[PDB]
Amino acid sequence: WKDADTTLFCASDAKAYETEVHNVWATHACVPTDPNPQEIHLENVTENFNMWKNNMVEQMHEDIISLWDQSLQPCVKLTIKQACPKISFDPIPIHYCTPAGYVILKCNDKNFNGTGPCKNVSSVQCTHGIKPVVSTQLLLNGSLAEEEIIIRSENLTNNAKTIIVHLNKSVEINCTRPSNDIRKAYCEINGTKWNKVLKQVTEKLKEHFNNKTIIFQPPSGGDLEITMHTFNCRGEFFYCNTTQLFNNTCIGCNGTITLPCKIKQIINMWQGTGQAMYAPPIDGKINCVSNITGILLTRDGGANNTSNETFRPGGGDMRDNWRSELYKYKVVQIE
Numbered sequence: 001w002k003d004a005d006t007t008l009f010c011a012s013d014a015k016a017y018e019t020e021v022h023n024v025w026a027t028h029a030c031v032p033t034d035p036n037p038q039e040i041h042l043e044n045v046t047e048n049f050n051m052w053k054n055n056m057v058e059q060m061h062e063d064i065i066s067l068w069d070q071s072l073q074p075c076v077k078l079t080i081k082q083a084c085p086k087i088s089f090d091p092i093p094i095h096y097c098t099p100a101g102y103v104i105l106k107c108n109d110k111n112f113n114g115t116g117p118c119k120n121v122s123s124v125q126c127t128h129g130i131k132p133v134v135s136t137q138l139l140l141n142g143s144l145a146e147e148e149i150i151i152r153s154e155n156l157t158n159n160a161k162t163i164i165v166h167l168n169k170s171v172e173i174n175c176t177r178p179s180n181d182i183r184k185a186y187c188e189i190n191g192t193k194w195n196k197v198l199k200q201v202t203e204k205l206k207e208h209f210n211n212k213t214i215i216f217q218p219p220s221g222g223d224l225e226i227t228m229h230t231f232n233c234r235g236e237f238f239y240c241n242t243t244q245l246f247n248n249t250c251i252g253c254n255g256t257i258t259l260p261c262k263i264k265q266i267i268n269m270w271q272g273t274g275q276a277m278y279a280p281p282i283d284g285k286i287n288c289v290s291n292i293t294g295i296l297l298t299r300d301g302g303a304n305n306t307s308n309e310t311f312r313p314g315g316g317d318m319r320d321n322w323r324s325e326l327y328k329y330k331v332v333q334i335e
Protein backbone atom coordinates (compact mmCIF):
# COMPACT_ATOMS: atom_id res chain seq x y z
CA TRP A 1 0.00 0.00 0.00
CA LYS A 2 0.87 3.69 -0.04
CA ASP A 3 -0.48 6.72 1.78
CA ALA A 4 -3.33 8.19 -0.24
CA ASP A 5 -6.82 9.55 0.20
CA THR A 6 -10.04 8.92 -1.71
CA THR A 7 -13.57 10.14 -1.07
CA LEU A 8 -14.99 7.20 0.87
CA PHE A 9 -18.63 6.26 1.41
CA CYS A 10 -20.71 5.45 4.49
CA ALA A 11 -22.71 2.51 5.84
CA SER A 12 -25.59 2.59 8.33
CA ASP A 13 -27.85 0.16 10.17
CA ALA A 14 -30.80 2.51 9.71
CA LYS A 15 -34.47 1.64 9.25
CA ALA A 16 -36.41 2.55 6.12
CA TYR A 17 -39.63 3.26 8.06
CA GLU A 18 -38.50 5.40 11.01
CA THR A 19 -38.62 9.16 10.52
CA GLU A 20 -35.84 9.86 13.02
CA VAL A 21 -33.79 12.13 10.86
CA HIS A 22 -30.36 10.55 11.33
CA ASN A 23 -31.88 7.40 9.80
CA VAL A 24 -33.57 9.40 7.05
CA TRP A 25 -30.33 11.00 5.87
CA ALA A 26 -28.28 7.81 6.25
CA THR A 27 -30.77 5.58 4.41
CA HIS A 28 -30.55 7.74 1.27
CA ALA A 29 -26.85 8.57 1.69
CA CYS A 30 -25.31 5.30 2.96
CA VAL A 31 -25.54 1.64 1.97
CA PRO A 32 -26.33 -1.30 4.29
CA THR A 33 -23.47 -2.29 6.56
CA ASP A 34 -21.27 -5.06 5.24
CA PRO A 35 -23.06 -8.21 6.51
CA ASN A 36 -19.82 -10.16 7.10
CA PRO A 37 -16.93 -7.70 7.47
CA GLN A 38 -13.59 -9.15 8.47
CA GLU A 39 -10.39 -7.84 10.04
CA ILE A 40 -6.92 -9.18 9.31
CA HIS A 41 -3.94 -8.38 11.53
CA LEU A 42 -1.00 -7.88 9.18
CA GLU A 43 1.74 -10.27 10.33
CA ASN A 44 4.08 -7.95 12.26
CA VAL A 45 3.74 -5.10 9.74
CA THR A 46 4.06 -1.85 11.68
CA GLU A 47 2.56 1.38 10.34
CA ASN A 48 2.44 4.93 11.72
CA PHE A 49 -0.65 7.16 11.62
CA ASN A 50 -1.62 10.57 13.01
CA MET A 51 -5.17 11.86 13.51
CA TRP A 52 -4.45 15.60 13.21
CA LYS A 53 -3.44 14.84 9.60
CA ASN A 54 -6.27 12.46 8.68
CA ASN A 55 -8.66 13.19 5.83
CA MET A 56 -11.61 11.02 6.88
CA VAL A 57 -11.99 13.40 9.83
CA GLU A 58 -12.48 16.28 7.39
CA GLN A 59 -14.68 14.13 5.15
CA MET A 60 -16.80 12.83 8.03
CA HIS A 61 -17.08 16.46 9.21
CA GLU A 62 -18.52 17.48 5.82
CA ASP A 63 -21.04 14.64 6.20
CA ILE A 64 -22.70 15.84 9.41
CA ILE A 65 -22.66 19.44 8.11
CA SER A 66 -24.69 18.41 5.07
CA LEU A 67 -26.73 16.06 7.27
CA TRP A 68 -27.83 18.82 9.67
CA ASP A 69 -28.48 21.32 6.86
CA GLN A 70 -30.82 18.70 5.40
CA SER A 71 -32.14 17.84 8.83
CA LEU A 72 -32.16 20.32 11.76
CA GLN A 73 -33.69 23.17 9.92
CA PRO A 74 -34.00 26.59 11.57
CA CYS A 75 -36.94 28.96 11.59
CA VAL A 76 -34.41 31.71 10.84
CA LYS A 77 -30.72 31.36 9.94
CA LEU A 78 -28.53 34.48 9.94
CA THR A 79 -25.47 33.41 7.93
CA ILE A 80 -33.60 33.59 5.30
CA LYS A 81 -36.76 32.21 6.90
CA GLN A 82 -37.88 28.60 6.45
CA ALA A 83 -40.19 26.05 8.05
CA CYS A 84 -39.07 24.55 11.37
CA PRO A 85 -41.27 21.59 12.35
CA LYS A 86 -40.03 19.73 15.40
CA ILE A 87 -38.65 16.33 14.41
CA SER A 88 -37.34 13.16 16.03
CA PHE A 89 -33.58 13.02 16.54
CA ASP A 90 -31.33 10.34 18.04
CA PRO A 91 -27.75 9.39 17.01
CA ILE A 92 -27.19 6.33 14.81
CA PRO A 93 -23.90 4.44 14.34
CA ILE A 94 -22.23 5.34 11.03
CA HIS A 95 -19.39 3.43 9.37
CA TYR A 96 -17.00 4.65 6.67
CA CYS A 97 -15.60 2.49 3.87
CA THR A 98 -12.99 2.89 1.14
CA PRO A 99 -14.24 2.37 -2.44
CA ALA A 100 -12.79 -0.06 -5.00
CA GLY A 101 -9.01 0.27 -4.81
CA TYR A 102 -8.20 1.30 -1.24
CA VAL A 103 -8.46 -0.16 2.26
CA ILE A 104 -8.63 1.29 5.78
CA LEU A 105 -5.77 0.28 8.07
CA LYS A 106 -6.65 0.26 11.77
CA CYS A 107 -4.46 0.30 14.89
CA ASN A 108 -5.12 -2.35 17.54
CA ASP A 109 -2.47 -1.57 20.17
CA LYS A 110 -4.13 -0.53 23.41
CA ASN A 111 -1.58 2.19 24.29
CA PHE A 112 -1.83 4.09 20.99
CA ASN A 113 -2.24 7.83 21.45
CA GLY A 114 -3.12 8.59 17.82
CA THR A 115 0.29 9.86 16.64
CA GLY A 116 3.25 7.65 15.86
CA PRO A 117 4.05 4.05 14.94
CA CYS A 118 1.43 1.40 15.62
CA LYS A 119 2.64 -2.21 15.75
CA ASN A 120 -0.60 -4.24 15.95
CA VAL A 121 -2.01 -3.02 12.62
CA SER A 122 -4.95 -4.69 10.89
CA SER A 123 -6.90 -4.10 7.68
CA VAL A 124 -10.62 -3.33 7.32
CA GLN A 125 -12.95 -2.36 4.51
CA CYS A 126 -15.18 -0.28 6.81
CA THR A 127 -14.82 1.63 10.06
CA HIS A 128 -16.74 0.77 13.24
CA GLY A 129 -20.11 2.06 14.40
CA ILE A 130 -18.99 5.65 14.90
CA LYS A 131 -21.79 7.61 16.58
CA PRO A 132 -21.79 11.24 15.27
CA VAL A 133 -22.48 12.99 18.57
CA VAL A 134 -22.26 16.78 18.38
CA SER A 135 -21.25 18.20 21.76
CA THR A 136 -18.73 20.52 23.39
CA GLN A 137 -16.26 20.26 26.26
CA LEU A 138 -17.02 16.66 27.22
CA LEU A 139 -17.25 13.76 24.78
CA LEU A 140 -20.62 12.04 24.44
CA ASN A 141 -21.65 8.49 23.54
CA GLY A 142 -18.20 7.80 22.07
CA SER A 143 -15.87 4.83 22.33
CA LEU A 144 -13.93 3.68 25.40
CA ALA A 145 -10.24 3.39 26.21
CA GLU A 146 -8.96 -0.17 25.85
CA GLU A 147 -6.45 0.36 28.70
CA GLU A 148 -5.22 3.44 30.56
CA ILE A 149 -6.78 6.82 29.92
CA ILE A 150 -4.99 8.45 26.99
CA ILE A 151 -4.09 12.09 26.34
CA ARG A 152 -4.31 12.90 22.62
CA SER A 153 -2.63 16.05 21.32
CA GLU A 154 -1.00 17.16 18.08
CA ASN A 155 1.73 18.97 20.05
CA LEU A 156 1.71 19.09 23.86
CA THR A 157 3.94 22.16 23.94
CA ASN A 158 1.82 24.20 21.51
CA ASN A 159 -1.07 25.51 23.61
CA ALA A 160 -3.21 26.71 20.68
CA LYS A 161 -3.97 23.05 19.87
CA THR A 162 -6.71 21.17 21.69
CA ILE A 163 -6.19 18.25 24.10
CA ILE A 164 -8.43 15.17 24.06
CA VAL A 165 -8.63 12.90 27.12
CA HIS A 166 -9.88 9.39 26.32
CA LEU A 167 -11.52 7.88 29.42
CA ASN A 168 -11.39 4.18 30.26
CA LYS A 169 -14.47 4.64 32.44
CA SER A 170 -17.78 5.85 31.02
CA VAL A 171 -19.01 8.39 33.54
CA GLU A 172 -22.55 9.42 32.77
CA ILE A 173 -24.79 12.49 32.72
CA ASN A 174 -28.59 12.43 32.93
CA CYS A 175 -30.23 15.59 31.60
CA THR A 176 -33.93 16.43 31.80
CA ARG A 177 -36.41 19.25 31.15
CA PRO A 178 -39.53 18.34 33.15
CA SER A 179 -42.90 19.80 32.22
CA ASN A 180 -45.34 22.04 34.13
CA ASP A 181 -39.81 28.08 33.20
CA ILE A 182 -40.37 26.15 29.96
CA ARG A 183 -36.60 26.35 29.44
CA LYS A 184 -35.34 25.31 32.88
CA ALA A 185 -33.31 22.10 32.61
CA TYR A 186 -30.76 20.22 34.70
CA CYS A 187 -28.28 17.36 34.36
CA GLU A 188 -27.40 15.00 37.21
CA ILE A 189 -23.98 13.36 37.54
CA ASN A 190 -22.80 11.04 40.29
CA GLY A 191 -20.34 13.17 42.23
CA THR A 192 -17.89 10.54 43.45
CA LYS A 193 -17.87 8.55 40.18
CA TRP A 194 -16.91 11.53 38.02
CA ASN A 195 -14.56 12.88 40.70
CA LYS A 196 -12.86 9.49 41.14
CA VAL A 197 -12.36 9.51 37.36
CA LEU A 198 -11.11 13.10 37.21
CA LYS A 199 -8.72 12.63 40.13
CA GLN A 200 -7.31 9.91 37.89
CA VAL A 201 -7.38 12.29 34.91
CA THR A 202 -5.12 14.90 36.52
CA GLU A 203 -2.69 12.25 37.76
CA LYS A 204 -2.42 10.57 34.35
CA LEU A 205 -2.10 14.09 32.92
CA LYS A 206 0.56 15.44 35.30
CA GLU A 207 2.92 12.76 33.95
CA HIS A 208 3.13 14.55 30.59
CA PHE A 209 3.98 17.83 32.37
CA ASN A 210 7.07 17.00 34.45
CA ASN A 211 4.99 16.40 37.61
CA LYS A 212 3.97 20.06 37.54
CA THR A 213 1.08 20.87 39.86
CA ILE A 214 -1.95 20.55 37.60
CA ILE A 215 -5.21 22.38 38.30
CA PHE A 216 -8.69 22.75 36.79
CA GLN A 217 -10.85 25.83 36.24
CA PRO A 218 -13.91 27.01 34.28
CA PRO A 219 -13.88 28.56 30.80
CA SER A 220 -12.34 32.04 30.64
CA GLY A 221 -13.91 33.88 27.73
CA GLY A 222 -16.35 32.52 25.19
CA ASP A 223 -19.86 32.61 23.76
CA LEU A 224 -21.87 30.13 25.86
CA GLU A 225 -21.40 27.25 23.39
CA ILE A 226 -17.73 27.01 24.38
CA THR A 227 -18.14 28.07 28.02
CA MET A 228 -21.29 26.02 28.72
CA HIS A 229 -21.49 22.33 27.88
CA THR A 230 -23.66 22.40 24.74
CA PHE A 231 -25.22 19.38 23.04
CA ASN A 232 -28.45 18.29 21.36
CA CYS A 233 -31.06 16.19 23.18
CA ARG A 234 -34.17 14.94 21.35
CA GLY A 235 -33.86 17.85 18.92
CA GLU A 236 -33.20 20.51 21.57
CA PHE A 237 -29.92 22.30 22.25
CA PHE A 238 -28.91 22.12 25.91
CA TYR A 239 -26.54 24.66 27.48
CA CYS A 240 -25.32 23.27 30.80
CA ASN A 241 -23.08 25.10 33.27
CA THR A 242 -20.15 22.77 34.01
CA THR A 243 -18.51 24.92 36.68
CA GLN A 244 -19.30 22.15 39.19
CA LEU A 245 -16.87 19.70 37.53
CA PHE A 246 -13.69 21.76 36.97
CA ASN A 247 -13.99 23.97 40.06
CA ASN A 248 -15.87 22.12 42.81
CA THR A 249 -12.41 20.75 43.80
CA CYS A 250 -12.86 17.60 45.93
CA ILE A 251 -9.35 16.70 44.72
CA GLY A 252 -17.93 16.59 51.96
CA CYS A 253 -18.79 15.90 48.33
CA ASN A 254 -19.79 12.37 47.29
CA GLY A 255 -23.45 12.90 46.35
CA THR A 256 -25.18 13.51 43.04
CA ILE A 257 -23.59 16.59 41.49
CA THR A 258 -26.40 18.55 39.83
CA LEU A 259 -25.65 21.08 37.07
CA PRO A 260 -28.17 23.55 35.60
CA CYS A 261 -29.20 23.86 31.96
CA LYS A 262 -31.02 26.21 29.60
CA ILE A 263 -32.73 25.50 26.28
CA LYS A 264 -31.45 28.18 23.91
CA GLN A 265 -33.58 29.13 20.92
CA ILE A 266 -30.77 31.09 19.24
CA ILE A 267 -27.64 29.08 18.45
CA ASN A 268 -24.35 30.27 17.01
CA MET A 269 -23.76 27.65 14.34
CA TRP A 270 -21.10 24.99 14.85
CA GLN A 271 -21.15 24.25 11.10
CA GLY A 272 -20.63 27.58 9.36
CA THR A 273 -20.50 31.00 11.02
CA GLY A 274 -23.66 32.77 12.13
CA GLN A 275 -26.72 32.55 14.34
CA ALA A 276 -29.88 30.50 13.86
CA MET A 277 -33.09 30.75 15.91
CA TYR A 278 -35.64 27.94 16.33
CA ALA A 279 -38.79 27.52 18.38
CA PRO A 280 -39.71 26.58 21.96
CA PRO A 281 -39.09 23.04 23.20
CA ILE A 282 -42.04 20.74 22.70
CA ASP A 283 -44.08 19.90 25.77
CA GLY A 284 -43.34 16.82 27.84
CA LYS A 285 -40.34 15.66 29.84
CA ILE A 286 -37.20 15.83 27.68
CA ASN A 287 -34.63 13.39 29.04
CA CYS A 288 -31.35 12.12 27.58
CA VAL A 289 -29.06 9.51 29.14
CA SER A 290 -25.58 10.09 27.70
CA ASN A 291 -22.12 8.71 28.44
CA ILE A 292 -19.09 10.91 29.02
CA THR A 293 -16.20 9.06 27.43
CA GLY A 294 -13.76 11.95 26.93
CA ILE A 295 -13.17 15.66 27.42
CA LEU A 296 -11.67 18.44 25.31
CA LEU A 297 -9.41 20.90 27.13
CA THR A 298 -7.23 23.89 26.24
CA ARG A 299 -3.98 24.67 28.06
CA ASP A 300 -2.98 28.07 29.40
CA GLY A 301 -1.14 30.49 27.18
CA GLY A 302 1.43 31.93 29.55
CA ALA A 303 1.70 29.60 32.55
CA ASN A 304 5.34 29.04 31.55
CA ASN A 305 7.27 30.67 34.40
CA THR A 306 4.96 29.00 36.91
CA SER A 307 4.68 25.85 39.02
CA ASN A 308 1.20 25.15 37.62
CA GLU A 309 -0.87 24.66 34.46
CA THR A 310 -4.57 25.49 34.68
CA PHE A 311 -6.83 23.57 32.31
CA ARG A 312 -10.15 24.72 30.86
CA PRO A 313 -12.59 22.75 28.72
CA GLY A 314 -12.39 23.19 24.96
CA GLY A 315 -15.01 23.69 22.30
CA GLY A 316 -15.70 25.08 18.87
CA ASP A 317 -14.02 22.78 16.36
CA MET A 318 -16.18 19.67 16.07
CA ARG A 319 -13.45 17.90 14.08
CA ASP A 320 -11.76 16.75 17.29
CA ASN A 321 -14.98 14.96 18.25
CA TRP A 322 -14.64 13.19 14.90
CA ARG A 323 -10.92 12.68 15.52
CA SER A 324 -11.62 11.01 18.88
CA GLU A 325 -13.21 7.94 17.30
CA LEU A 326 -11.21 8.13 14.03
CA TYR A 327 -7.87 8.16 15.91
CA LYS A 328 -7.23 4.56 14.81
CA TYR A 329 -8.00 4.56 11.05
CA LYS A 330 -5.87 5.56 8.06
CA VAL A 331 -6.87 5.02 4.43
CA VAL A 332 -4.16 3.51 2.22
CA GLN A 333 -3.94 2.79 -1.51
CA ILE A 334 -3.25 -0.81 -2.54
CA GLU A 335 -0.37 -1.17 -5.01
Ligand SMILES: C[C@@H]1CN(C(=O)N2CCC[C@H](C(=O)Nc3ccc(Cl)c(F)c3)C2)C[C@H](C)N1C
Pocket residue numbers: 134135136223225226230231232237267268269270271272273274315316317318
Ligand atom coordinates in the same frame (compact mmCIF):
# COMPACT_ATOMS: atom_id res chain seq x y z
C1 LIG B 1 -15.97 28.44 11.07
C2 LIG B 1 -15.87 28.29 12.63
C3 LIG B 1 -17.23 28.78 13.17
N1 LIG B 1 -17.57 28.26 14.44
C4 LIG B 1 -17.89 29.15 15.57
O1 LIG B 1 -17.84 30.31 15.36
N2 LIG B 1 -18.23 28.75 16.94
C5 LIG B 1 -18.55 29.77 17.98
C6 LIG B 1 -20.01 29.66 18.41
C7 LIG B 1 -20.42 28.27 18.71
C8 LIG B 1 -19.94 27.27 17.73
C9 LIG B 1 -20.44 25.87 18.22
O2 LIG B 1 -19.68 24.99 18.47
N3 LIG B 1 -21.88 25.72 18.34
C10 LIG B 1 -22.62 24.54 18.75
C11 LIG B 1 -23.94 24.43 18.34
C12 LIG B 1 -24.70 23.34 18.70
C13 LIG B 1 -24.14 22.35 19.49
CL1 LIG B 1 -25.10 20.93 19.97
C14 LIG B 1 -22.83 22.45 19.91
F1 LIG B 1 -22.29 21.47 20.69
C15 LIG B 1 -22.06 23.55 19.55
C16 LIG B 1 -18.42 27.39 17.53
C17 LIG B 1 -17.53 26.84 14.37
C18 LIG B 1 -16.07 26.40 14.09
C19 LIG B 1 -16.03 24.83 13.98
N4 LIG B 1 -15.53 26.96 12.92
C20 LIG B 1 -14.29 26.87 12.97
Ligand SMILES: *[C@@H]1O[C@H](CO)[C@@H](O)[C@H](O)[C@H]1NC(C)=O
Pocket residue numbers: 041108109120
Ligand atom coordinates in the same frame (compact mmCIF):
# COMPACT_ATOMS: atom_id res chain seq x y z
C1 LIG C 1 -3.72 -7.39 18.08
O1 LIG C 1 -5.05 -6.90 18.20
C2 LIG C 1 -6.02 -7.88 17.82
C3 LIG C 1 -7.38 -7.23 17.96
O2 LIG C 1 -7.93 -7.45 19.25
C4 LIG C 1 -5.86 -9.13 18.68
O3 LIG C 1 -5.54 -10.24 17.84
C5 LIG C 1 -4.79 -8.95 19.75
O4 LIG C 1 -5.24 -8.03 20.74
C6 LIG C 1 -3.47 -8.45 19.15
N1 LIG C 1 -2.69 -9.56 18.62
C7 LIG C 1 -1.58 -10.02 19.21
C8 LIG C 1 -0.91 -11.17 18.53
O5 LIG C 1 -1.15 -9.52 20.25
Ligand SMILES: *[C@@H]1O[C@H](CO)[C@@H](O)[C@H](O)[C@H]1NC(C)=O
Pocket residue numbers: 147148149168169200203204
Ligand atom coordinates in the same frame (compact mmCIF):
# COMPACT_ATOMS: atom_id res chain seq x y z
C1 LIG D 1 -7.98 3.78 33.89
O1 LIG D 1 -6.62 4.19 33.69
C2 LIG D 1 -5.95 4.63 34.89
C3 LIG D 1 -4.57 5.08 34.48
O2 LIG D 1 -4.44 6.49 34.53
C4 LIG D 1 -5.93 3.49 35.91
O3 LIG D 1 -5.33 3.95 37.12
C5 LIG D 1 -7.34 3.00 36.18
O4 LIG D 1 -7.31 1.87 37.05
C6 LIG D 1 -8.03 2.62 34.87
N1 LIG D 1 -9.40 2.20 35.12
C7 LIG D 1 -9.97 1.17 34.49
C8 LIG D 1 -11.39 0.88 34.85
O5 LIG D 1 -9.36 0.49 33.67
Ligand SMILES: *[C@@H]1O[C@H](CO)[C@@H](O)[C@H](O)[C@H]1NC(C)=O
Pocket residue numbers: 113114115116117151152153156
Ligand atom coordinates in the same frame (compact mmCIF):
# COMPACT_ATOMS: atom_id res chain seq x y z
C1 LIG E 1 2.45 9.38 21.35
O1 LIG E 1 3.29 8.23 21.27
C2 LIG E 1 4.53 8.48 20.58
C3 LIG E 1 5.23 7.15 20.44
O2 LIG E 1 5.13 6.38 21.63
C4 LIG E 1 5.34 9.51 21.35
O3 LIG E 1 6.55 9.78 20.66
C5 LIG E 1 4.53 10.79 21.52
O4 LIG E 1 5.23 11.70 22.36
C6 LIG E 1 3.16 10.48 22.14
N1 LIG E 1 2.34 11.68 22.19
C7 LIG E 1 1.65 12.05 23.27
C8 LIG E 1 0.84 13.30 23.14
O5 LIG E 1 1.68 11.40 24.31
Ligand SMILES: *[C@@H]1O[C@H](CO)[C@@H](O)[C@H](O)[C@H]1NC(C)=O
Pocket residue numbers: 155156157158
Ligand atom coordinates in the same frame (compact mmCIF):
# COMPACT_ATOMS: atom_id res chain seq x y z
C1 LIG F 1 5.26 22.29 18.97
O1 LIG F 1 5.16 23.66 19.40
C2 LIG F 1 6.42 24.26 19.72
C3 LIG F 1 6.13 25.66 20.22
O2 LIG F 1 5.30 26.37 19.32
C4 LIG F 1 7.34 24.24 18.50
O3 LIG F 1 8.62 24.75 18.88
C5 LIG F 1 7.49 22.83 17.97
O4 LIG F 1 8.25 22.83 16.76
C6 LIG F 1 6.11 22.22 17.71
N1 LIG F 1 6.24 20.85 17.23
C7 LIG F 1 6.20 20.52 15.94
C8 LIG F 1 6.35 19.06 15.63
O5 LIG F 1 6.04 21.36 15.06
Ligand SMILES: *[C@@H]1O[C@H](CO)[C@@H](O)[C@H](O)[C@H]1NC(C)=O
Pocket residue numbers: 141142144169170291
Ligand atom coordinates in the same frame (compact mmCIF):
# COMPACT_ATOMS: atom_id res chain seq x y z
C1 LIG G 1 -22.50 3.69 28.51
O1 LIG G 1 -21.40 3.02 29.16
C2 LIG G 1 -21.67 1.68 29.58
C3 LIG G 1 -20.44 1.19 30.31
O2 LIG G 1 -19.25 1.73 29.75
C4 LIG G 1 -22.02 0.83 28.36
O3 LIG G 1 -22.32 -0.50 28.78
C5 LIG G 1 -23.22 1.44 27.65
O4 LIG G 1 -23.50 0.70 26.47
C6 LIG G 1 -22.94 2.89 27.28
N1 LIG G 1 -24.11 3.49 26.67
C7 LIG G 1 -24.11 4.00 25.43
C8 LIG G 1 -25.41 4.58 24.96
O5 LIG G 1 -23.11 3.99 24.72
Ligand SMILES: *[C@@H]1O[C@H](CO)[C@@H](O)[C@H](O)[C@H]1NC(C)=O
Pocket residue numbers: 174175176188
Ligand atom coordinates in the same frame (compact mmCIF):
# COMPACT_ATOMS: atom_id res chain seq x y z
C1 LIG H 1 -32.46 10.68 35.42
O1 LIG H 1 -33.08 11.80 36.07
C2 LIG H 1 -34.50 11.70 36.20
C3 LIG H 1 -34.97 12.98 36.85
O2 LIG H 1 -34.33 13.18 38.10
C4 LIG H 1 -34.87 10.46 37.01
O3 LIG H 1 -36.29 10.32 37.04
C5 LIG H 1 -34.24 9.21 36.39
O4 LIG H 1 -34.49 8.09 37.23
C6 LIG H 1 -32.74 9.41 36.22
N1 LIG H 1 -32.14 8.25 35.59
C7 LIG H 1 -31.72 7.18 36.27
C8 LIG H 1 -31.12 6.07 35.46
O5 LIG H 1 -31.82 7.11 37.49
Ligand SMILES: *[C@@H]1O[C@H](CO)[C@@H](O)[C@H](O)[C@H]1NC(C)=O
Pocket residue numbers: 207209210211
Ligand atom coordinates in the same frame (compact mmCIF):
# COMPACT_ATOMS: atom_id res chain seq x y z
C1 LIG I 1 6.69 12.01 38.99
O1 LIG I 1 6.71 11.47 40.31
C2 LIG I 1 6.53 10.05 40.34
C3 LIG I 1 6.45 9.65 41.80
O2 LIG I 1 5.26 8.93 42.08
C4 LIG I 1 7.67 9.36 39.59
O3 LIG I 1 7.44 7.96 39.57
C5 LIG I 1 7.77 9.90 38.17
O4 LIG I 1 8.93 9.38 37.54
C6 LIG I 1 7.83 11.42 38.17
N1 LIG I 1 7.80 11.93 36.81
C7 LIG I 1 8.24 13.15 36.46
C8 LIG I 1 8.10 13.51 35.02
O5 LIG I 1 8.72 13.92 37.29
Ligand SMILES: *[C@@H]1O[C@H](CO)[C@@H](O)[C@H](O)[C@H]1NC(C)=O
Pocket residue numbers: 224227228241242243
Ligand atom coordinates in the same frame (compact mmCIF):
# COMPACT_ATOMS: atom_id res chain seq x y z
C1 LIG J 1 -21.91 28.99 36.03
O1 LIG J 1 -22.32 29.18 37.39
C2 LIG J 1 -21.40 29.94 38.19
C3 LIG J 1 -21.94 29.94 39.60
O2 LIG J 1 -21.89 28.64 40.17
C4 LIG J 1 -21.27 31.34 37.60
O3 LIG J 1 -20.32 32.08 38.36
C5 LIG J 1 -20.83 31.26 36.15
O4 LIG J 1 -20.82 32.56 35.57
C6 LIG J 1 -21.77 30.36 35.35
N1 LIG J 1 -21.30 30.21 33.98
C7 LIG J 1 -21.61 31.06 33.00
C8 LIG J 1 -21.03 30.75 31.65
O5 LIG J 1 -22.32 32.04 33.19
Ligand SMILES: *[C@@H]1O[C@H](CO)[C@@H](O)[C@H](O)[C@H]1NC(C)=O
Pocket residue numbers: 090091133140141231232233234288289290291
Ligand atom coordinates in the same frame (compact mmCIF):
# COMPACT_ATOMS: atom_id res chain seq x y z
C1 LIG K 1 -26.56 8.98 23.95
O1 LIG K 1 -27.14 7.68 23.77
C2 LIG K 1 -28.34 7.46 24.52
C3 LIG K 1 -28.74 6.02 24.31
O2 LIG K 1 -29.20 5.79 22.98
C4 LIG K 1 -29.41 8.46 24.09
O3 LIG K 1 -30.57 8.27 24.88
C5 LIG K 1 -28.89 9.88 24.26
O4 LIG K 1 -29.84 10.81 23.75
C6 LIG K 1 -27.56 10.06 23.52
N1 LIG K 1 -27.03 11.39 23.75
C7 LIG K 1 -27.03 12.35 22.82
C8 LIG K 1 -26.44 13.66 23.23
O5 LIG K 1 -27.48 12.16 21.69
Ligand SMILES: *[C@@H]1O[C@H](CO)[C@@H](O)[C@H](O)[C@H]1NC(C)=O
Pocket residue numbers: 157158159301302304
Ligand atom coordinates in the same frame (compact mmCIF):
# COMPACT_ATOMS: atom_id res chain seq x y z
C1 LIG L 1 6.77 29.39 26.73
O1 LIG L 1 5.64 29.14 25.88
C2 LIG L 1 6.00 29.09 24.49
C3 LIG L 1 4.72 28.88 23.71
O2 LIG L 1 3.57 29.10 24.52
C4 LIG L 1 7.04 27.99 24.23
O3 LIG L 1 7.47 28.07 22.88
C5 LIG L 1 8.23 28.13 25.17
O4 LIG L 1 9.09 27.00 25.03
C6 LIG L 1 7.75 28.24 26.61
N1 LIG L 1 8.87 28.40 27.52
C7 LIG L 1 9.18 27.49 28.45
C8 LIG L 1 10.35 27.81 29.33
O5 LIG L 1 8.55 26.44 28.57
Ligand SMILES: [Cl-]
Pocket residue numbers: none
Ligand atom coordinates in the same frame (compact mmCIF):
# COMPACT_ATOMS: atom_id res chain seq x y z
CL1 LIG M 1 9.07 -13.16 9.30
